[PDB]
Amino acid sequence: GVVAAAEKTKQGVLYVGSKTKEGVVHGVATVAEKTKEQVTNVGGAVVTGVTAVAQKTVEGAGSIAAATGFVKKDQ
């Protein structure tokens, strides 16, 4: 004869900007099996494949994925 027994007898400050999660990317699972990509750029800008990116700027101009083809100022 086999016996198995188990028992459990269980008796019984301002915070102005304190705890903030700001500019956060947490938890990402990405899979790419067969992705062919081909880019031909002539005199401009090309931005591809920007993933899992975070930033926080204070008193400044912040851009994650920005592209400007050309800037010309002549006199």
Q: Which residues are annotated as a binding site?
A: 26
Binding site members for Cu cation: 26
Shortest separation between residue 50's beta carbon and a second copy, angstroms: 5
Q: What whole-number distance in Å separates Cα of residue 60 and Cα of residue 63? A: 10
Shortest separation between residue 67's beta carbon and a second copy, angstroms: 4
Residue carrying structure tokens 């903030």:
20
Shortest separation between residue 16's beta carbon and a second copy, angstroms: 5
* Cβ neighbours for 27, distance < 8 A, ≥ 6 positions apart: none
